[PDB]
Amino acid sequence: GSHMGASRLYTLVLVLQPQRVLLGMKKRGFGAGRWNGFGGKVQEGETIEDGARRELQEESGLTVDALHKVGQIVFEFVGEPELMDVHVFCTDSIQGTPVESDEMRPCWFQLDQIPFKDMWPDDSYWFPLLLQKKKFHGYFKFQGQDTILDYTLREVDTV
Ligand SMILES: c1ccc([C@H]2CCCN2c2ccnc3[nH]ccc23)cc1
């Protein structure tokens, strides 16, 4: 449903090949210490997909042929005025070999060895839908970094 208030655009890119997925260990700032897809804030003057590519390149060195819209997640953090509006993409057309950046240390994971205990707890809900090639809309309300207070999740035809 609707979540009122100013939101800030973010991207999240999952490089998902047939038997493995690329994740990055976040090395600094909010969420350091957890594995996640590549992304960050969308800037003034670039499209959401541009920002997704830019972030993947800054964080892993990779470029891709194509990105595919797979989901949208809204995050609320208790006490934080701004909502996070996260646009999730997937790709299987990487150009290059991933390398470590200031922000992220990339590693490949087998699809049955996804490190959910060292990921954001919301990923346990929506990551399986990405693996199943289902498009989704999610909402998660957090108290701090560990506790989901409320959430919604459904599949969509249009991201
Ligand atoms: C793009 C890249 C990284 C993030 C991380 C760090 C800031 C906050 N953040 C999250 C918060 C909550 N769930 C989440 N699931 C994956 C990420 C995530 C967000 C967008």
GROMACS .gro file of C-alpha atoms and ligand atoms in nm:
model
  179
    1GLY     CA    1   0.000   0.000   0.000
    2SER     CA    2   0.093   0.370   0.027
    3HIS     CA    3   0.371   0.506   0.248
    4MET     CA    4   0.347   0.881   0.293
    5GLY     CA    5   0.639   1.118   0.311
    6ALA     CA    6   0.952   1.213   0.127
    7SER     CA    7   1.153   0.917  -0.001
    8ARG     CA    8   1.507   0.897  -0.131
    9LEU     CA    9   1.586   0.683  -0.439
   10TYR     CA   10   1.835   0.393  -0.412
   11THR     CA   11   1.949   0.112  -0.639
   12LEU     CA   12   2.041  -0.246  -0.564
   13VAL     CA   13   2.191  -0.474  -0.831
   14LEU     CA   14   2.216  -0.849  -0.807
   15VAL     CA   15   2.449  -1.016  -1.057
   16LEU     CA   16   2.269  -1.353  -1.073
   17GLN     CA   17   2.420  -1.625  -1.294
   18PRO     CA   18   2.271  -1.977  -1.326
   19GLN     CA   19   2.449  -2.130  -1.026
   20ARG     CA   20   2.576  -1.837  -0.823
   21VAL     CA   21   2.524  -1.479  -0.719
   22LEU     CA   22   2.767  -1.189  -0.657
   23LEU     CA   23   2.746  -1.001  -0.332
   24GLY     CA   24   2.966  -0.739  -0.172
   25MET     CA   25   3.077  -0.706   0.187
   26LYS     CA   26   2.995  -0.345   0.282
   27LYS     CA   27   3.309  -0.197   0.430
   28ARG     CA   28   3.191   0.136   0.571
   29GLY     CA   29   2.892   0.341   0.679
   30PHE     CA   30   2.539   0.228   0.753
   31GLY     CA   31   2.528  -0.147   0.717
   32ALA     CA   32   2.905  -0.216   0.720
   33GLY     CA   33   2.964  -0.582   0.804
   34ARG     CA   34   2.682  -0.732   0.596
   35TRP     CA   35   2.679  -0.872   0.246
   36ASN     CA   36   2.443  -0.699  -0.002
   37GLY     CA   37   2.395  -0.628  -0.370
   38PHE     CA   38   2.575  -0.334  -0.533
   39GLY     CA   39   2.414   0.009  -0.514
   40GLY     CA   40   2.345   0.331  -0.330
   41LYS     CA   41   2.183   0.669  -0.372
   42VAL     CA   42   2.058   0.786  -0.708
   43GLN     CA   43   2.209   1.126  -0.791
   44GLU     CA   44   2.062   1.439  -0.945
   45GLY     CA   45   2.096   1.424  -1.323
   46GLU     CA   46   2.102   1.045  -1.377
   47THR     CA   47   1.816   0.797  -1.435
   48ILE     CA   48   1.760   0.519  -1.179
   49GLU     CA   49   1.914   0.256  -1.414
   50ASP     CA   50   2.214   0.494  -1.484
   51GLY     CA   51   2.267   0.523  -1.108
   52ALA     CA   52   2.246   0.144  -1.070
   53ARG     CA   53   2.520   0.097  -1.338
   54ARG     CA   54   2.732   0.379  -1.193
   55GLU     CA   55   2.716   0.222  -0.844
   56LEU     CA   56   2.798  -0.131  -0.971
   57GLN     CA   57   3.104   0.011  -1.153
   58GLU     CA   58   3.232   0.223  -0.859
   59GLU     CA   59   3.181  -0.067  -0.616
   60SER     CA   60   3.292  -0.372  -0.821
   61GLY     CA   61   3.449  -0.239  -1.145
   62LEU     CA   62   3.183  -0.426  -1.347
   63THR     CA   63   2.980  -0.296  -1.639
   64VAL     CA   64   2.684  -0.488  -1.781
   65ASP     CA   65   2.500  -0.519  -2.109
   66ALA     CA   66   2.155  -0.500  -1.950
   67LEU     CA   67   1.982  -0.452  -1.615
   68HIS     CA   68   1.635  -0.590  -1.549
   69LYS     CA   69   1.382  -0.443  -1.304
   70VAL     CA   70   1.294  -0.714  -1.050
   71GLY     CA   71   1.156  -0.529  -0.747
   72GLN     CA   72   1.090  -0.225  -0.535
   73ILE     CA   73   1.142  -0.210  -0.160
   74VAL     CA   74   1.045   0.074   0.069
   75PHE     CA   75   1.233   0.095   0.400
   76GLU     CA   76   1.128   0.293   0.709
   77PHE     CA   77   1.370   0.326   0.998
   78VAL     CA   78   1.211   0.432   1.323
   79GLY     CA   79   1.314   0.789   1.411
   80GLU     CA   80   1.444   0.858   1.056
   81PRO     CA   81   1.226   1.110   0.861
   82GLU     CA   82   1.326   0.997   0.511
   83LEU     CA   83   1.199   0.670   0.362
   84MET     CA   84   1.428   0.461   0.141
   85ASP     CA   85   1.284   0.384  -0.202
   86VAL     CA   86   1.497   0.099  -0.333
   87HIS     CA   87   1.486  -0.012  -0.695
   88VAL     CA   88   1.613  -0.366  -0.735
   89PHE     CA   89   1.769  -0.493  -1.054
   90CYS     CA   90   1.920  -0.818  -1.177
   91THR     CA   91   2.171  -0.897  -1.450
   92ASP     CA   92   2.348  -1.196  -1.600
   93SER     CA   93   2.556  -1.001  -1.851
   94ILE     CA   94   2.859  -0.881  -1.660
   95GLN     CA   95   3.151  -0.746  -1.854
   96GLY     CA   96   3.472  -0.789  -1.657
   97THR     CA   97   3.590  -0.955  -1.337
   98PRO     CA   98   3.478  -0.807  -1.007
   99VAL     CA   99   3.731  -0.625  -0.785
  100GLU     CA  100   3.731  -0.480  -0.436
  101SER     CA  101   3.662  -0.107  -0.391
  102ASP     CA  102   3.669   0.127  -0.089
  103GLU     CA  103   3.300   0.051  -0.032
  104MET     CA  104   3.263  -0.320  -0.117
  105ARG     CA  105   3.454  -0.652  -0.118
  106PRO     CA  106   3.288  -0.876  -0.376
  107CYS     CA  107   3.255  -1.252  -0.364
  108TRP     CA  108   3.060  -1.519  -0.551
  109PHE     CA  109   2.812  -1.738  -0.357
  110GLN     CA  110   2.647  -2.063  -0.459
  111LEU     CA  111   2.273  -2.032  -0.458
  112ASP     CA  112   2.240  -2.284  -0.173
  113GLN     CA  113   2.514  -2.099   0.030
  114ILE     CA  114   2.367  -1.749   0.040
  115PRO     CA  115   2.493  -1.597   0.365
  116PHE     CA  116   2.156  -1.486   0.501
  117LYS     CA  117   2.276  -1.464   0.865
  118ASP     CA  118   2.532  -1.198   0.756
  119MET     CA  119   2.278  -1.009   0.533
  120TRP     CA  120   1.997  -0.764   0.609
  121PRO     CA  121   1.709  -0.960   0.768
  122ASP     CA  122   1.462  -0.845   0.498
  123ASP     CA  123   1.671  -1.032   0.234
  124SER     CA  124   1.548  -1.361   0.387
  125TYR     CA  125   1.196  -1.263   0.263
  126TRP     CA  126   1.252  -1.118  -0.082
  127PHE     CA  127   1.577  -1.276  -0.207
  128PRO     CA  128   1.399  -1.608  -0.263
  129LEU     CA  129   1.150  -1.428  -0.495
  130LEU     CA  130   1.442  -1.287  -0.697
  131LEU     CA  131   1.590  -1.641  -0.720
  132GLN     CA  132   1.255  -1.768  -0.840
  133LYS     CA  133   1.241  -1.493  -1.107
  134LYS     CA  134   0.931  -1.331  -0.950
  135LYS     CA  135   0.888  -0.953  -0.953
  136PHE     CA  136   0.795  -0.801  -0.615
  137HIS     CA  137   0.704  -0.497  -0.402
  138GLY     CA  138   0.816  -0.493  -0.042
  139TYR     CA  139   0.781  -0.269   0.259
  140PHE     CA  140   0.992  -0.321   0.574
  141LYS     CA  141   0.978  -0.109   0.891
  142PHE     CA  142   1.296  -0.138   1.101
  143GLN     CA  143   1.381  -0.054   1.461
  144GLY     CA  144   1.756  -0.006   1.429
  145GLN     CA  145   1.948  -0.248   1.204
  146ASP     CA  146   1.825  -0.590   1.333
  147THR     CA  147   1.446  -0.578   1.403
  148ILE     CA  148   1.172  -0.582   1.145
  149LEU     CA  149   0.859  -0.446   1.317
  150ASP     CA  150   0.622  -0.453   1.022
  151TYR     CA  151   0.649  -0.573   0.664
  152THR     CA  152   0.453  -0.638   0.349
  153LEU     CA  153   0.553  -0.838   0.042
  154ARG     CA  154   0.370  -0.933  -0.274
  155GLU     CA  155   0.444  -1.032  -0.629
  156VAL     CA  156   0.372  -0.786  -0.910
  157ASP     CA  157   0.335  -0.792  -1.285
  158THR     CA  158   0.489  -0.442  -1.314
  159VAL     CA  159   0.776  -0.328  -1.091
  160LIG     C1  160   2.155  -0.020  -0.150
  160LIG     C2  161   2.271  -0.079  -0.100
  160LIG     C3  162   2.280  -0.108   0.036
  160LIG     C4  163   2.174  -0.078   0.122
  160LIG     C5  164   2.188  -0.111   0.269
  160LIG     C6  165   2.288  -0.017   0.341
  160LIG     C7  166   2.200   0.105   0.370
  160LIG     C8  167   2.068   0.040   0.418
  160LIG     N1  168   2.067  -0.090   0.348
  160LIG     C9  169   1.968  -0.183   0.362
  160LIG    C10  170   1.870  -0.171   0.463
  160LIG    C11  171   1.771  -0.268   0.479
  160LIG     N2  172   1.761  -0.379   0.406
  160LIG    C12  173   1.854  -0.389   0.312
  160LIG     N3  174   1.862  -0.493   0.223
  160LIG    C13  175   1.969  -0.474   0.138
  160LIG    C14  176   2.032  -0.357   0.170
  160LIG    C15  177   1.960  -0.299   0.280
  160LIG    C16  178   2.059  -0.019   0.071
  160LIG    C17  179   2.050   0.011  -0.064
   0.00000   0.00000   0.00000
